[PDB]
């Protein structure tokens, strides 16, 4: 269907505990494929998905270099940041960076991203037009004048519109078996009496890829959304995902309820109910 490639960078300062920590990962849709950790024996860009490892030595060395450089450029970033907010050098602070592209099935840009957060809140972000910036406060505006002088936005547009998209096409192609073979969810319904008079019905969905999924409960053909509890979609540990939906029902009326599952890897949406034994 539609796809995206994202990078996520975390830079954490650590007072009296040496240089800061840098951990960044790369994702094509919901599949991690690359990692970099500055505390590893000898820091380098690493493969975290099968498909990405046939790539030649240049790819790896090039990215290792870009990660190594970042360690220094964002060392000063955390320095400057702590300066803009008149913060003690004894505290620990966090700089996060995310950027990437969204391509429709057709493979053309839907929108590019380049955002930053300091200590947990939006700091500065490139807008959808890819030519303007949105600063969270007057400190970020300092950054905004620096990058506007450097014609930074003009540089990112070249990457997001060029490099990002092309490497996304390439990746979705190399591992098209892992990346565009949608895994249908294994579903079932469980029953759990809360009391004498009330029972919980749990609609399960396991082993599905990608993460996007819709689980809804109905009392007769009628939706029950804020009668339904949903858990956050969680990783199974093997690249597939899991999720469940529960509703508390009056005992004896269990069969008035049905569960409806929607997922990309399914021919047609499923409809389940509880099996009395």
């Amino acid at each position: 269907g539609s796809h995206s490639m994202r990078y996520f960078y975390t830079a954490v300062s650590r007072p009296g505990r040496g240089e800061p920590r840098f951990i960044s990962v790369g994702y094509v849709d919901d599949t991690q494929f690359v990692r970099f950790d500055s505390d590893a024996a000898s820091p380098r860009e690493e493969p975290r998905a099968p498909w990405i490892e046939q790539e030649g030595p240049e790819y790896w060395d090039r990215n290792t270099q870009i990660c190594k450089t970042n360690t220094q450029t964002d060392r000063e970033s955390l320095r400057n940041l702590r300066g803009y907010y008149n913060q003690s050098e004894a505290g620990s602070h966090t700089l996060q960076w995310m950027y990437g592209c969204d391509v429709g099935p057709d493979g053309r840009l839907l929108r590019g991203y380049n955002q930053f957060a300091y200590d947990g809140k939006d700091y500065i972000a490139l807008n959808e037009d890819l030519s303007s910036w949105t600063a969270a406060d007057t400190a970020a505006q300092i950054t905004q004048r620096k990058w506007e002088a450097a014609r930074e936005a003009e540089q990112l547009r070249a990457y997001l519109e060029g490099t990002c998209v092309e490497w996304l096409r390439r990746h979705l192609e190399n591992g098209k078996e892992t990346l565009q073979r949608a895994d249908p969810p294994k579903t079932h319904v469980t029953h759990h009496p809360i009391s004498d008079h009330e029972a919980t019905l749990r609609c399960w969905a396991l082993g599905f890829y990608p993460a996007e999924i819709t689980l809804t409960w109905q009392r007769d053909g009628e939706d029950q959304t804020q009668d339904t509890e949903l858990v956050e979609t969680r990783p199974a540990g093997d690249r597939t995902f899991q999720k469940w939906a529960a509703v508390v029902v009056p005992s004896g009326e269990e069969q008035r309820y049905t569960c409806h599952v929607q997922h990309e890897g399914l021919p047609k949406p499923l409809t389940l109910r509880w099996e009395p034994s």
Partner: peptide
């Protein structure tokens, strides 16, 4: 590939 950003914040 990743994006090389020489600019600091």
């Amino acid at each position: 590939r990743r994006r090389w950003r020489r600019l600091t914040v």
